[PDB]
Design a protein around this ligand. Sequence first.
Ligand SMILES: O=[N+]([O-])c1ccc2nn[nH]c2c1
Length: 305
Amino acid sequence: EAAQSIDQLIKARGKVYFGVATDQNRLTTGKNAAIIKADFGMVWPENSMSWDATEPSQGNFNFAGADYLVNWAQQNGKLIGAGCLVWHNFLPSWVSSITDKNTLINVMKNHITTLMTRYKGKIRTWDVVGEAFNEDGSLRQNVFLNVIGEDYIPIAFQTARAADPNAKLYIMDYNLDSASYPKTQAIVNRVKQWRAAGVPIDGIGSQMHLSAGQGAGVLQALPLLASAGTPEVSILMLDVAGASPTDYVNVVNACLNVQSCVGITVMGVADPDSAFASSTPLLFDGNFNPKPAYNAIVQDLQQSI
Ligand SMILES: O=[N+]([O-])c1ccc2nn[nH]c2c1
């Protein structure tokens, strides 16, 4: 049927992409590859770029998984996003154990530089720092903050910019979905301050793992995130418990309303492959058919001349 690719449709409304997280296991099973080819314009490695996946012991990198994703994307004319270079998730214990500031700075920089160098020029968007905030808006006391202090964020971004000046560099977080929530306010105010200091934060990515009914609030939260003045904002890791068309269309329209929002990435293709499968939160079902939210996004994005 005509005009059924949400990526094609969102591009026709001036955005860069509709994307999805994936990896080798997905691409070779189900109908994921076919759906991504037809309907999506950007992919991200779901897990294969994590620190656990890529640098399981100090200085010794594992790129088979990430390479597969990058190659598939290139073969299929998809943009690539990748991450997360620096966050508290999927960290090896060898990183967590480090207590010396200069050692951890250099471990972090080596991790950033190695990954970004390998894929230099190939990656549209790097999620450089993730989940750096507490719910109250203070900085999360992860190993980087505890050992390096708050300079770890400027250092990560400056390192990333040097490693691949072509990439758009993002900070990302979750629970940025309500405009009155302290975390949302805080990332904005802090990104403003980092950018005023010349830290090369090109984007804020909102990890939109939503519960039912939360789409509406994104219509206020996304504009708020964009007010930090980054060149770009993005929607990441999108899923919605119950997958209501209302929620999904609200999220999409928040993207459309926000000039600097370049695109939307969903957390996966089909419900059974979600980490939250019982909540059926994705756009395709367990038979790989498009759900009502997919079709509602199509209608919302369709445009006579
Ligand atoms: O938007 N994404 O679905 C997504 C998935 C995994 C990631 N790791 N870093 N950034 C990511 C974005």
